[model samples]
Target: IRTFGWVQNPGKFENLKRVVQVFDRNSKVHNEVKNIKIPTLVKESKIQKELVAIMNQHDLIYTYKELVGTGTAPCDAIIQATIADQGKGYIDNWSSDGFLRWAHALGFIEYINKSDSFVITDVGLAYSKSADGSAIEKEILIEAISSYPPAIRILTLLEDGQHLTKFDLGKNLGFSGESGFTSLPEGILLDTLANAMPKDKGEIRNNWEGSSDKYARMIGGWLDKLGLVKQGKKEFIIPTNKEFISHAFKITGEGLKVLRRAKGSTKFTRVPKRVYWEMLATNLTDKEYVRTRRALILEILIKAGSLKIEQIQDNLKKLGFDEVIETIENDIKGLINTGIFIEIKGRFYQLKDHILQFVIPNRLVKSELEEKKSELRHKLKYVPHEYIELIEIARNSTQDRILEMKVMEFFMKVYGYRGKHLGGSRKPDGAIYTVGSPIDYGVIVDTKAYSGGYNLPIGQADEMQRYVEENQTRNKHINPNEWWKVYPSSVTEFKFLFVSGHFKGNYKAQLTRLNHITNCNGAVLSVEELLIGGEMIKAGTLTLEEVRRKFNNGEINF
Candidate 1:
């Protein structure tokens, strides 16, 4: 009855509970019957035997290495191998070592050459020469399971089985931040065990990197190895007459068997708080070894999650971390001195605040670039300050790019021009050469950053037309060795762009007439239109021609 209680899924527990309710209703001294008895000794178990039989199901050494070296999409390896190998699946070689470790522990195998990988001894092999299906005792199984360094705790906690991304999975198991801030009992015990067991410490600490990411990835693989978790999509593993599946992971049936077993949760003796704390003091001294200090400090931060220096020290003491405040403070001071984290108001240090700095370093670099539009406005007599400001605002909104760079971006993205002129002493803002198109000659875009009463200069118009006729002595940005290869005397259109921040009176009509007389395409763009079109071109919502046509036709302006 006690064993039956372990099966909660519409099994003997439910049936027995229903009967007990009826017996209670009959009222024939039903209160006399207490709870089921804890047996003095459990009968011989078949679980370890079944586990051993399945352990040798297949050798997946090659596939395991492939998956580790160059990972397949979650179930890609499993499905491909199942079809290719006639439905007989294989175990991950990484987890196969866990079984080998057990076999070695049980005197079933001895290492032939400990340095030459997991090859077993000849005497160890002879015991395996006869195929006698022997089983280890439950005590041995329990010891193996309990002695597992912190990993089995993760497995046990996840047996409740929620589909979680690696980030969320870490958060739930005290690997990520404390959202609700509940102290997880399992985490405390496992954390203590990691500190107490020196043999376990190296492997446990080695599982993580800078964050929980590496640890989360590793645990998922180990669980997948145990046949406790399915890491593949449902479609690949299960074929239905009607539907297709994409991706997910869930606990398996064999997972449930382990969850119910004594070794999984129950039956482990708890460490006395003093002993746990004392062992932690010893683990704390591991920081004396220069090679191991970083790993230890990282584990402290990983467990504490953005704690202040004082709070981190206190939490370490609270959780059996065993390091004195002065010792921890100095170590953190050294890490800070190395610029791992920016130090704030004295005695307050934040490490991960440095990670957030990476998010906007590009913006900082852009700020350092000198504005070119101001210089160009003064250089070109036809250009206005308002036009320069309009381009300047657009550049500021995105990263810093002068009008010429924006125009070159447009040419490359829209008209498919690999070789386009950006900016030079004699070149227009930007120009593109077309190949085999209707207009064999490319378009030269001249940006007039002027708002005042500006008379149209014939010299500027003549200079713009030269972009259509002949190449100037300007070096190409991309390919320097080939000059004329980048710009040819290809012919046709010139788009004269006028940036008038505020349009007044008959300027629009006069601008249209001026463009016609100059033999060109004209566009009166607000700072709004220039910025909007630049953004649209970048986002791929509009192609280069798409943006050009809208701007040329006055459809792009506000």
Candidate 2:
């Protein structure tokens, strides 16, 4: 009469309180299996004790292999500390069914938890009191990043700031209240600021503000170093030639302001465009000029599917806008850099030429481009060893900055550890070091030195694609009369990456199916995206291989 899958003992449900009656049976097992060797160095240590405490604290039955001892305990302590846990006892049966039966209560774990993967809850922590779970049990581990005085001061002076004239930050950083009189001295200022947090709460709270004042000034320094973000403007402002903010962090002026809030603050809303592509489109009064040019460019491609530089220039002369030829030439550099338009054999230009295999139409619309999108969304391969560094960094550095810098440096160091592959080649974006090894996640950012701008047909009733066609300045520019026709490439796949950059109407005349021409900041970044941004940030051309190799920090354990 027992219900399904029931194991009977005494009638426990019948007794609300205590009822004792000795009914014993042989508690023996009948199975044959082998033991698994502990695959880590987690033995008795301080760290092991901490890990074991968490599991034993919770009601969850951790897999024998997942135990972490306290710091007094060694790495992977409990997981492999004893031979008994590793010895196979119940290969076909639950070793401890008593705990598992109590865990699957409806809504007990799910109702209170936000993460589905984690089984041990505060309730489990209270009731279970012992580490017991599967090999892959999820647990939260917290570690603080160590903040040095020097680094903190540098980051701090950046907060509660004036325009970051080095003279200003260095000289004024040490001074006392209100008056511009005797603040900190110049020679020792930056070094001193590095260690001290401001005594004033207000100053401490207002720290990350004035980002332009801070980052821009350093960019000026980095520029002098790169010969790009040069000092100019009659005044001491950095040169206008380069995009502001180093591309690596894309620290927008607005973002800087947001981070300078009170000590305990939420991260700011990210700026949309880190790299401005509209800079490609030169001197157009408005959309009208852009439309004609875009159309003419497309029409030429549609008819012949190709064009040479000289022929394009001649065609532009035939049109009313003969003045645009020079502007088009300039936009070519940005396009080539981005890789949307690859120059053939370093000379001729084309749209699909760089891709080699796939011949994209004048406009390959969305629905048909899914495979292309998937290919583009490439994820770096992951190996397990990287977690140790992540944990180590977390424990040592509480502040996001030092940790970020050190970790990024670690990635660069590890991946950049080896020499250039092809004579001198290190593609820092996503180059894998060892074919299938633990992957460095740093290279997998959504916006690597991000680049994009919000273009408007100026004003519009709604955001319909046709606006790209109807309001554009020139037909040579490829304006769409219908929205569907404009970016048929994005709608079904990755839709809508409009740009505000403008090139002279004559630019397209020079582009062919073979030249490197990326009009918008979309898809895999052309070399142009990296060059412009990297130059701005002062990192230069890092090969993907260099970046990947930098991630291997050797094995670390919890």
Model 2 — which ten-residue stretch has the worst lDDT? 16-25
TM-scores, one per candidate: 0.25, 0.17
- Candidate 1 wrongly placed segments (more than 4 Å): 1-401, 410-417, 422-425, 433-441, 448-494, 498-510, 534-541, 547-558
In order, the Cα lDDT scores of the candidates are 0.35, 0.25
Best prediction by TM-score = 1
Candidate 2 segments exceeding 4 Å error: 1-287, 298-306, 334-339, 353-558
lDDT of 1: 0.35
Cα lDDT of candidate 2 equals 0.25
Over 51-106, each residue of candidate 2 has an lDDT whose tens digit, in order, gives 43543332443432242223322234322232222233111113122112112221
lDDT of 1 by residue, 1-558 (tens): 000000101112122222122112122212211111101111123422322232223421122222111222221221111111113232233222333333333233323221322223332333323223324333222233322322343454456776543333443332121111111122222232332336654443333221233334444544564466676533212121222121234667765565444232336432111000111111111212321233355455644444576786666556444444444554454333222333445656544421110010111111211123324333333322223334333322222223334345444654365554444435455555556555444455555434343233555545554553343333454334322444465543445554423333454454465456555555555544554554545555655555445435232362
